[PDB]
Amino acid sequence: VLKFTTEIHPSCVTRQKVIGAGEFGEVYKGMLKEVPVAIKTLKAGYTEKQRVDFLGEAGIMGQFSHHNIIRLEGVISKYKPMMIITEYMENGALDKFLREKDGEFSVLQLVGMLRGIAAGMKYLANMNYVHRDLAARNILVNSNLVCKVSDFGLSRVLEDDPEATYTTSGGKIPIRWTAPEAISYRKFTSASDVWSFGIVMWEVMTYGERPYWELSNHEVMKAINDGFRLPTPMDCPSAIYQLMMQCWQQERARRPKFADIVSILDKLIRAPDSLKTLADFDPRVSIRLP
Template identity: 45%
Template sequence: MEPFLRKRLTFLSFFWDKIWPAGAAPSPDPDAEVEREPAPRVEPCSGPAPARLFRVLHDFRAQSAGQLSVSRGDRLYGLREEGGCVLACRLTGWPSTGLVPLTHVAKATPEPLSDQPWYFSGISRTQAQQLLLSPANAPGAFLIRPSESCHGDFSLSVRAQTGVLHYRVSTAADGGLYLQKDRLFPSLEELLAYYKANWKLIQNPLLQPCVPQKPPEWDEWERPRSEFTLRRKLGRGYFGEVWEGLWLGFMPVAVKVIRAADMKLTDLAQEIRTLKSLRHERLIRLHAVCSAGEPVYIVTELMRKGSLRAFLGSPEGQVLSPPVLLTFACQVAEGMSYLEERRVVHRDLAARNVLVGDDLACKVADFGLARLLKDDFYSPSSSSQIPVKWTAPEAASYRVYSPKSDVWSFGVLLYELFTYGQCPYEGMSNHETLQRISRGYRLPRPAACPAEVYALMLECWSYNPDLRPDFSALQERLGAVGRRRRP
């Protein structure tokens, strides 16, 4: 309002100066073509503040007016230490400031921007306005995005009562970030913490991160490839390359990129109809496909800790106790039991095709994709490609796949679990593995594996498929073992 009146009614400049004295922080102009930077204030500059990020270890309930109630997992920005407490601003939930005992917090490192709920990569000013004005957001919703007009800077977009306002977040020569030139911050997280607590400086409160619009449940799952941005290659397997990507510029997804030369595209439509009908918390959720042209994209939810096999071999995975490994086994058995009920055969169950989330939830992936691969790529005659060491004898030799062949593979997955990702039949060729299995050889019991679990593994490896248990029985028996061994 102020810029509009000053520009069009200049003869009243004396009156405007009385209302808006020089040096006051102006409101951004929603009609401006570029983001406006709030005018610098005259308060002294203290230089870039040191990083003071904390993570709450234990719940704390305020016992006086100056204290701040926090919950385990909250993130705080520390303003200063006072005795045995830290004066902190809460970065999660409703913004507020108060004292928290140092015994209840630990120093934390800034999270990557891509993990922040308020950071939206790859969206324009217009898209930011559309998101913030959607019914899911109220005044006080905000987001930060890369600046369109100045590479390396950012824009803070805020929903106000009258519309969406945009502020330029500039980068100083020393790397500090600022809305006002005399107040620098080492990170966007700390800049937001300050302006949440001192929102009157920009005349608009910052109450909650913008709620993204959820992708609709498409009747046609085929989506244009332009909706997806590939950001980081996660790995490669039998079914092509796997990338971390963004859907519509903000939703993190996993994108499996498959070449048409390796896949029977004529069967893809039927397989997708099957995959989209399978919904269970222990199965990777399918979001979309791009099969028009090459390469084919199969888009699923993103599990940030990657494959179970890689996770077991990581420092975090190596210290997991057997009871935790048992919970992983139960989760996989639960997902496979769901597939078994619907007569869906996985064909390639292994730790590499189970994914792990930040909350240590395990989900079965790539179910049914083996049927789409070209015969000459995934067949017994191509021993370098078929996963013989995970495949039941009747499937490896005669291509007879069934839920019982998946049960054999599950026994091998249990071996991977309790050896922390060790390759089964290590040192044996595929041909030697098949020969020794036919003569009665079975993998030995891993050191960390409970005896009752190893007994289940041996049942999974019965040469006669009819003697193998089904997944519902495996889920129940593994759960019983877990309950008995729980501390």
Template identity: 65%
Template sequence: MVRTQEQEFRTLPQDTGMPSGGVIVCIIFGVLLFIGLVAGLIIYRRRQAHHHRARPCQKHSGYNRDEIWLKPYVDLQPYEDPSRGVLEFTKELDPSLVNIENVIGEGEFGEVYRGTLCFPGKERIVVAIKTLKSSYSDSTWWNFLREATIMGQFNHQNIVRLEGVVTKRSPMMIITEYMDNGALDTFLRENMDKFSAVQLVTMLQGIASGMTYLSDRNYVHRDLAARNILVSHCLLCKVSDFGLSRILENDVEGTYETKGGKIPIRWTAPEAIAHRIFTSASDVWSFGIVMWEVLSYGDKPYGDMTNQEVMKSIEDGYRLPPPVDCPSVLYELMKVCWSYDRTRRPRFREIHAQLDHFISSPHLLRTVADFDPRVTLRLPSCSGSDGIPYRSIPEWLESIRMKRYILNFRTAGLNTMESVLELSAEDLKQMGVTLPGHQKRILCSIQGFKE
């Protein structure tokens, strides 16, 4: 009897004062999980803090990483009746909610107005209203509906937002958010030299963010230019005007081939000009031109060169020279965007990341790109004397992007190219050319004439 009780007693675990192995594993796992959660929270808050410091005007900025898994854009082509596609992707508005005010421009389909939109029980908002001309053709009607369905499928802070459409009554309307500062090219020309390099890069980053969103959806814009970027009151840039846009098919190259029609030569990649084949890589080329427009405050790419001269120059290896006071890192990015081989061009996601890096490290923007007097906007039709390739001072200043000083030279009594050959920095200062970068560019070009 005693033996049995002793055996029963000895089968119990001996108390050593230490937890069992299973308990130890649970404790270690819990500690590691807690450390991982704390570290993740710290990293998240730091990223959010940097996010808002870089773009104080936006609630969110950059592309949404989670959004890239959404379905690609759907074109109107599968619909026998395009009106069905419009109903699926847009909101039909009662015309009584829309109040048309004043004309603000002329669009592809008709006049564009500023107006207001007021839903019952909600605050009235300012909107832009694209209208369709009463004398529209079937193709114009189709393209009008198509642009509405394009915008209706996009939801991103750097894409102009569609508020709704009016398609069941005349005039037909596309109603979008209103952008106070209008088109980017005009806005920059009206605010010459008023922004810092970081501000200009932030504008470009917004555009790159919108284009990343589009390219992630196998979508190509085809008409990316500063004139088609709209600017809000807080300098937020949004991609707009999808009149030339096309869906990219799910093929190996991801290309869209047109059957003809107009293309914007000065903004278009060489393979798109030559073969009418467009990809997101051709949009990247266009983005490089937009960068040049922004850094030159809305200047015209390639100056007074004809479209034929532009095409030939590009095929010969010519690329736009850096704008005045352009940071060298930005000009290097432009040149990569203008790689003749489209496979060597960066993707929009990479461009976005690089611009973000420049914003967080502004010291990288301090070094200005060198200006080579041999690489200017040569006007092939011009022929000066004594080896000077320009017949007049205005043509010369235009070629080196200094046309803003034409009046300064005239006021100083300088009327011939020969009269500028002995100018010094002090002479330029007395003429009103006070910015060191501008003086350097003019003097560098003059020195080029003498060599």
């Protein structure tokens, strides 16, 4: 897969600002000889596994060509430190973006973000790629408000995400984003990604609220097994809440496919008055005045 990738010479790459970090490398904003890029490094002393996982992310990204999937510019593999270079998403991770922009977008803009995410996910699913870690923290946002799916690879995806925790039976999983069958018996498919997408829908419509609030991981699993689901966000179109609820069907076969999700979101956006009908919000506070 690396043969598809452009090998970039180090002298074309200028790292400027540190935007992400880890123990074995950092992510930078930089310039590529005259365009802005993001640059992820892998420090010397890396293991064979680290090299295979690191370059494997670029290999996977290089197989994709879609508006809603992060674009690979190239790799530096013949010099050290090794680097992966992608387009630069000016607004960063979607979860933090929404929390910093609380209430600043229209309902139509929020639904448009979800349509872009769904289109990227439909592409991945049809390319036989199961994400396993779909969440707003793994979506990136550009200066056109376009949302693109990121975080690709094999074992590195769940291993590197601190939201993914060790379960009781083994399996490092981000519990509150993960479908029941993936938690219970390790069955990760595009239909478990659809469950996760429903959680992403709730994250977007709430401007980055943490799913299930302070419930512990076990409390979340128990609640889901007992039939409870996340309540409607504030100011949420009825059609949007209905859609996220169908993503959370216990029976995998009853969930919409991403093809269905993209179609529904596209129809709602193209007839935007449909989004004015709101699901009832259950208030958690009563304010009474004479």
